[PDB]
Amino acid sequence: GEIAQALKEIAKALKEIAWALKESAQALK
Amino acid sequence: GEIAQALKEIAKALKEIAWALKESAQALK
Amino acid sequence: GEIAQALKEIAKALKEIAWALKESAQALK
Amino acid sequence: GEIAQALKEIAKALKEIAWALKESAQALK
Amino acid sequence: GEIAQALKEIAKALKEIAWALKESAQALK
Amino acid sequence: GEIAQALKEIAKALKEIAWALKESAQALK
Amino acid sequence: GEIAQALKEIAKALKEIAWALKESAQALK
Amino acid sequence: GEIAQALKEIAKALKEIAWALKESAQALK
């Protein structure tokens, strides 16, 4: 369904935020 | 549908937050 | 509809958060 | 409606988070 | 209604996050 | 109701995030 | 119910974010 | 159900954000 698909797109965007924060941890080290 | 479309706009905004955080990681490097 | 409109306002606020974080990346560089 | 109104209050709170993050970018500059 | 009331509690918690971030901006200055 | 109760648990978790951010502001001061 | 259970899992994940931020406050001090 | 499943994917993504923030706390220590 379209709502479930849109919520999955929100989860994928939150994973992108996690990847960006992992890169910030590498920059700090 | 309009609710699914609005949730997709929220996903796009969250991706913009990830892009901005990547810019911070590059600034620290 | 009113719910879709309110979710679009949430997306616009998340874009404002992204813009603020982009400014933080410029400040770090 | 009360749900739409509550979602608008969430959008306003997210805008307050953006304003606070802008204050951090100005402090770093 | 109970759902609207719970969403208002989420908005109040997001305002608390904004206040904490404003304090971080004062600490950076 | 169980949905309202779960949303209240999300509000409480967001307040915990605010408390943690206040600890960061105090560490910077 | 399954939706209430999934929202409780979101609250637990937000608590994990708070714990990670508390650790960052300890690192800054 | 598909909505509950999508919300569980959002919880998992939020846990990934917590893991990334823990990596930042370790980098600061």
Author numbering:
A (entry chain A), B (entry chain B), C (entry chain A), D (entry chain B), E (entry chain A), F (entry chain B), ...: 1 to 29
The authors write:
αHBs are oligomers of 5 or more α-helical peptides that assemble into coiled-coil structures with central solvent-accessible channels. We targeted two properties of αHBs: oligomeric state, which directly affects the internal diameter of the channel; and the identities of channel-facing residues, which fine tune this dimension and introduce different chemistries. The αHBs are loaded with an environment sensitive dye (in this case, 1,6-diphenyl-1,3,5-hexatriene, DPH) that binds within the channels and fluoresces. Accordingly, challenging the array with analytes leads to differential displacement of the dye across the array to give a fluorescent fingerprint.
We introduced mutations at one or two of these sites to generate four groups of αHB: Group I had entirely hydrophobic interiors, but with different sizes and shapes of channel; Groups II and III had polar uncharged or polar charged residues, respectively, at specific points along the channel; and Group IV had aromatic residues installed in their channels. Finally, one third of the designs were crystallized and yielded 12 X-ray crystal structures, all of which were open αHBs with fully accessible channels. Focusing on the small molecules, the αSA signal from the more-polar AAs and CHOs is dominated by the polar and charged Group II and III αHBs.
